[PDB]
């Protein structure tokens, strides 16, 4: 399947995805309150005169990660599974080329492998919580998802194409 | 529910309270002479942290071997 | 179970549950912000340092607890504000957990700088609240708005709950277990009852965040406030000639200008009758007597609707006087604007002046200089900008004849030249 | 003698008030401000004279503080000579110096005004019907630099907390400052003492303060009046009110709570001071908030109402009776929503965890209110379902 091509890059050619949008990003929603021509938000009085979407891997410390929130109309379970596949591909790439993932990861860190491993562990915990199954059964669920992605038959340079790929993989 | 609390305590990778609780639970599992309590404790610990951690507890020189039946 | 349509309130509540849990702290952070504003109002200018200046044990620990609550809330949803926030903030702000060693600006609610952070947070909280309320309203089918604005918010209009004391019990009471015969037990969540028990909220709120403001002079703001609260006009030729003849002295002009300034302030703060005489408004409503001896003769014809213009004229006149004496009329202006002109520039300025009203041009240029320049920007772009911002009478002469080759770095000098020409005519 | 400081102040009033801004955009406040100032900056009666003396003292303190951060402040006249702009602007040297003093005094006077004209406090000084104790307390708070501390700035905004209308004034002078002082003393006592004993310690701490030793001199009618007034202002500083009848009912409720506290006071019913108000509020904060929320949800309770707090229970009973008579009206949708919005407050009142040590009167009222709310709620369920 072609939907696996992005991940493939992140797993075998991550340097080509340094400027790519990953499904593991908040996707700032703005693109009420108003802004003055000087750049001061106001709903003038303050000044007396009337996209933020990052790229790469913009999730911080895995520890503070507690609840999975989706703002693109996808179920939290499928969002989490997509983030987990993405993290696995990123770990593969790191093992292949650590510097590419260090450039992708924002804020930068020293050990990408352990970073992504902690992210994967937190993902598994959240998934077991939001599905009720055991840890072993959650790992088996991931294995099931991978089996399906195999049996079924780009570079996410654009945020829109990233969301489209998210929707297709979720479907 | 008591065994579940003990399993959640033992799953933590423990200050004068959880230790006393686990000691009391061990005394209980030893005294009541029932395999099902230990079985449920093992099952909960597994559902929490994989069977690999359980089998690791099953090795000699471990402080949590009483969780297993005789 | 397609609950997005079967239980939309519960859906929206579960989506933002982790964030809604923190709305219960909005009262405390708002009280802290209001206290800081009250304390730090009318004052132009770290957390550990702010606490250090409190030997009061009780108030010290109280402020410390409030600050800790605020910082915990901020750090819990710092990243969320970076992306899912109506108020844009630089990445550096929402990228590191804060502590007592952080700058004492985040706590101060402002609309620029670190003070934005607090504000932003508050907004987000309110937004969350509002959102769920809207959902409830969309399920109520009656637009009953109990809006309680931020000026007065207690722990009664904010969605406050606890997962391990309120929601988890509520759910454990709806996990109805069902058992057939010959078939294993089964769970089933009475989703509708969960929504009904959770929708027992019925409250509303609105944003009126407390803040101070950065500055605590811009005569432009005063002029705009007066024009909004009152109608003004331009001094005729007769009044101009009269004030020019009467005000042969710099001291008298400055006294008249002081009266004009007091009047402008009072009018911007309250406003008044445009046609009411100025001397009357001053001696009766303001009681500005005992020092209006000679000024009244000049302001006998001036009404309040002329005040602004008057001010301008007076100021200009003063400068003009100092130029007739060869003194310095722009000491307060940056000396960078005092660069002389080249011969070609002088010829172009002369050509433009001969084809333009010297009086109005000088008045407007002086007003612009005093209001803004107090260098390489275009004196044609910025000038039309200042004129159109105030809806002024855009003349055709300066708009179609002003030599763009003239740089702002000599505006004053340009101005001076014009005055000289005028002084040469009279 | 060296200077007519009175005329100096009276000459800087307009400029001082033209630098003030009201949060609620009180338009007509500046003119009344300058009028009352010109009327008070006199020596007709001891009140005006004390006002003037205290203003001069505070301005002198401010100017001394400012001069401390300077070099040779005695050599100011010289700096006015060395400055030709001021000379050519004022003309004579005498006028230059006069204008210098005026510019030095204008902002300080403006700040003092902003700090003593919050919520129309100044009116208390001029209104002839203002009781004597009110003017005495005004001047006491104005003369206590420690209490009414005015920070020195080195425009202005008046922080009007209460939503008073035009010419309306706080019934108690500097109510906001007294409230803040009492809250500070309360947190101090809390940090210093136990959960019990905090009332007595707070009352004693306040009685040892100058404000307390002063208010203790008030005996009889004035005291009572004062207390009442304070409560009113207190509510306006704590709760946002809609009508004056609501404020009166809340005042009566808080006064009953205060009487209850002072009755269980470890002491005879000697006299009620301000700390008891804060104690009562902290004790019965939730009950009062619930009563206000009820009055806001169903304002008709106000005109439907005619030692211990019982206003909440009677308000709940009135709500129940109205819903029973207005049953299904004006239509099932609005009636059901009204019943729902009143569910939490009435349930709170209809619960023992919120009412403790109450009297058999309030107990019977809550019992009837429960016997009625069961009926109303069964009807509301029948409505919202069947
Ligand atoms: Zn602005």
From Swiss-Prot, chain C:
Effect of residue 188 to D: Variant detected in cases of Moyamoya disease in East Asian populations and rare variant detected in a sporadic case of Moyamoya disease; does not affect ubiquitination of lipopolysaccharide
Tissue expression profile of the protein: Widely expressed (at protein level).
Entry's induction text: Down-regulated by let-7c miRNA, which binds to the 3'-UTR transcript of RNF213. Induced by pro-inflammatory cytokines. (Microbial infection) Up-regulated in macrophages infected by M.tuberculosis.
Name of the gene encoding the protein in the UniProt record: RNF213
Subcellular location: Cytoplasm, Cytosol; Lipid droplet
PTM text: Autoubiquitinated.
Disease note: Moyamoya disease 2: A progressive cerebral angiopathy characterized by bilateral intracranial carotid artery stenosis and telangiectatic vessels in the region of the basal ganglia. The abnormal vessels resemble a 'puff of smoke' (moyamoya) on cerebral angiogram. Affected individuals can develop transient ischemic attacks and/or cerebral infarction, and rupture of the collateral vessels can cause intracranial hemorrhage. Hemiplegia of sudden onset and epileptic seizures constitute the prevailing presentation in childhood, while subarachnoid bleeding occurs more frequently in adults.
Domain of life: Eukaryota
Assembly with partners or alone: Monomer. Interacts with UBE2L3/UBCH7; UBE2L3/UBCH7 is the most efficient ubiquitin-conjugating enzyme E2 for the ubiquitin ligase activity. Interacts with UBE2N/UBC13; promoting 'Lys-63'-linked ubiquitination of target proteins.
Signal peptide annotation: none
Species whose genome carries this gene: Homo sapiens (Human)
Function: Atypical E3 ubiquitin ligase that can catalyze ubiquitination of both proteins and lipids, and which is involved in various processes, such as lipid metabolism, angiogenesis and cell-autonomous immunity. Acts as a key immune sensor by catalyzing ubiquitination of the lipid A moiety of bacterial lipopolysaccharide (LPS) via its RZ-type zinc-finger: restricts the proliferation of cytosolic bacteria, such as Salmonella, by generating the bacterial ubiquitin coat through the ubiquitination of LPS.
Impact upon substituting residue 384 to I: Rare variant detected in a sporadic case of Moyamoya disease in Caucasian population
Protein name, UniProt field: E3 ubiquitin-protein ligase RNF213
């Amino acid at each position: 399947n072609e939907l696996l091509e992005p991940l493939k890059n992140l797993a075998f050619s991550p340097a080509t995805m340094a400027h790519a949008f990953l499904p593991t990003m908040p996707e700032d929603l703005l693109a009420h309150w108003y802004t003055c021509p000087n750049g001061h938000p106001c709903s003038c009085i303050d000044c007396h005169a009337p996209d933020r979407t990052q790229t790469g891997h913009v999730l911080g410390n895995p520890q503070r990660r507690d609840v999975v929130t989706c703002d693109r109309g996808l179920p939290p379970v499928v969002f989490l599974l997509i983030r987990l596949l993405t993290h696995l591909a990123l770990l593969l790439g790191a093992s292949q080329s650590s510097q590419a993932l260090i450039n992708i990861i924002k804020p930068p860190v020293r050990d990408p492998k352990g970073f992504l491993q902690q992210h994967i562990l937190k993902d598994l915990e959240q998934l077991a919580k939001m599905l009720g199954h055991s840890a072993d059964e959650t790992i088996g669920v991931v294995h099931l998802v991978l089996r399906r992605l195999l049996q079924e038959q780009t570079e996410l340079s654009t945020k829109e194409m990233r969301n489209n790929w998210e929707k297709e993989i979720a479907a | 529910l008591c065994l579940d609390r003990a399993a959640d305590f033992l799953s933590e990778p423990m200050a004068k309270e959880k230790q006393c609780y686990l000691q009391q639970v061990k005394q209980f599992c030893i005294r009541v002479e029932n395999d099902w309590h230990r079985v449920y404790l093992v099952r909960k610990l597994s559902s929490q942290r994989g069977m690999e951690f359980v089998q690791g507890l099953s090795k000699p020189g471990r402080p949590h071997q009483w969780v297993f039946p005789k | 179970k397609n609950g997005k349509e079967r239980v939309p309130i519960l859906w929206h509540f579960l989506q933002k549950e982790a964030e809604l849990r923190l709305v219960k702290f909005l009262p405390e952070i708002l009280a802290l912000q209001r206290d800081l504003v009250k304390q730090f109002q009318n004052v132009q200018q770290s957390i550990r340092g702010f606490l250090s200046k409190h030997s009061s044990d009780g108030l010290r620990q109280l402020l410390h607890n409030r600050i800790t609550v605020f910082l915990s809330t901020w750090n819990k949803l710092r990243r969320s504000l970076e992306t899912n926030g109506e108020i844009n903030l630089p990445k550096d702000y929402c990228s590191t957990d804060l502590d007592l060693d952080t700058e004492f600006e985040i706590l101060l609610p402002r609309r620029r700088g670190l003070g934005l952070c607090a504000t932003a947070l508050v907004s987000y909280l309110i937004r969350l609240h509002n959102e769920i309320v809207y959902a409830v309203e969309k399920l109520s089918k009656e637009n009953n708005s109990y809006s309680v604005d931020a000026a007065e918010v207690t722990e009664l209009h904010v969605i406050s709950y606890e997962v391990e004391r309120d929601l988890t019990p509520l759910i454990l009471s709806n996990c109805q277990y069902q058992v057939e015969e010959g078939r294993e037990t089964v769970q089933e969540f009475d989703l509708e009852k969960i929504q009904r028990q959770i929708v027992s909220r019925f409250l509303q709120g609105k944003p009126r965040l407390s803040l101070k403001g950065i500055p605590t002079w811009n005569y432009e703001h005063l002029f705009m406030d007066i024009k909004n609260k009152m109608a003004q006009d331009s001094l005729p030729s007769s009044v101009i000639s009269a004030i020019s003849g009467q005000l042969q002295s710099y001291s008298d002009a400055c006294e008249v200008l002081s009266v004009v300034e007091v009047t402008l302030g009072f009018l911007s703060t309250a406003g008044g009758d445009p046609n009411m005489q100025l001397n009357v408004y001053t001696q009766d409503i303001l009681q500005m007597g005992d020092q209006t001896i000679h000024v009244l003769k000049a302001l006998n014809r001036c009404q309040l609707k002329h005040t602004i213009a008057l001010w301008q004229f007076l100021s200009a006149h003063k400068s003009e006087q100092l130029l007739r004496l060869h003194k310095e009329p722009f000491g307060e202006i940056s000396s960078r604007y005092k660069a002389d002109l080249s011969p070609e520039n002088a010829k172009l300025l002369s050509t433009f002046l001969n084809q333009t009203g010297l009086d109005a041009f000088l008045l407007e240029l002086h007003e612009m200089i005093i209001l803004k320049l107090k260098p390489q920007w275009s004196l044609r772009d910025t000038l039309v900008s200042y004129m159109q911002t105030k809806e002024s009478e855009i003349l055709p002469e300066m708009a179609s004849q002003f030599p763009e080759e003239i740089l702002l770095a000599s505006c004053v000098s340009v101005w001076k030249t014009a005055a000289v020409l005028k002084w040469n005519r009279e | 003698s060296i200077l007519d400081t009175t005329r100096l102040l009276r000459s800087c009033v307009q400029s001082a008030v033209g630098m003030l801004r009201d949060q609620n955009e009180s338009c007509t406040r500046n003119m009344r401000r300058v009028v009352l100032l010109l009327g008070l900056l006199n020596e007709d009666d001891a009140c005006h004279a004390s006002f003037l003396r205290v203003s001069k003292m505070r301005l002198s303190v401010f100017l001394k503080k400012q001069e401390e951060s300077q070099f040779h402040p005695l050599e100011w006249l010289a700096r006015e000579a060395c400055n030709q702009d001021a000379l050519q602007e004022a003309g004579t040297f005498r006028h230059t110096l006069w204008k210098r003093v005026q510019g030095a005094v204008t902002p300080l006077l403006a700040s003092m005004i902003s700090f003593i004209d919050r919520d129309g406090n100044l009116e208390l000084l001029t209104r002839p019907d203002t009781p004597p104790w009110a003017r005495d307390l005004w001047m006491f708070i104005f003369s206590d630099t420690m209490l009414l501390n005015i920070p020195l700035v080195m425009y202005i905004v008046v922080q009007n907390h209460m939503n008073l209308s035009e010419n309306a004034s706080n019934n108690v002078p500097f109510s906001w400052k007294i409230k803040d002082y009492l809250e500070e003393l309360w947190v101090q006592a809390q940090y210093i003492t136990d959960a019990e004993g905090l009332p007595k310690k707070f009352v004693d701490i306040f009685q040892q303060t100058p404000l307390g030793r002063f208010l203790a001199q008030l005996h009889g009618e004035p005291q009572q009046e004062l207390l009442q007034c304070y409560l009113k202002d207190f509510i306006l500083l704590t709760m946002r009110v809609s009508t004056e009848e609501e404020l009166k009912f809340l005042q009566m409720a808080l006064w009953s709570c205060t009487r209850k506290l002072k009755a269980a006071s470890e002491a005879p019913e000697e006299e009620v001071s301000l700390p008891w108000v804060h104690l009562a509020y902290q004790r019965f904060r939730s009950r009062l908030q619930n009563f206000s929320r009820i009055l806001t949800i169903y304002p008709q309770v106000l005109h439907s109402l005619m030692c211990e707090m019982t206003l909440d229970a009677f308000a709940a009973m009135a709500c129940t009776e109205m819903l029973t008579r207005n049953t299904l009206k004006p239509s099932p949708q609005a009636w059901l929503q009204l019943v729902k919005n009143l569910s939490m407050p009435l349930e709170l009142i209809c619960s023992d965890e919120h009412m403790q040590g109450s009297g058999s009167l309030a107990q019977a009222v809550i019992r009837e209110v429960r016997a009625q709310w069961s009926r109303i709620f069964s009807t509301a369920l029948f409505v919202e379902h069947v």
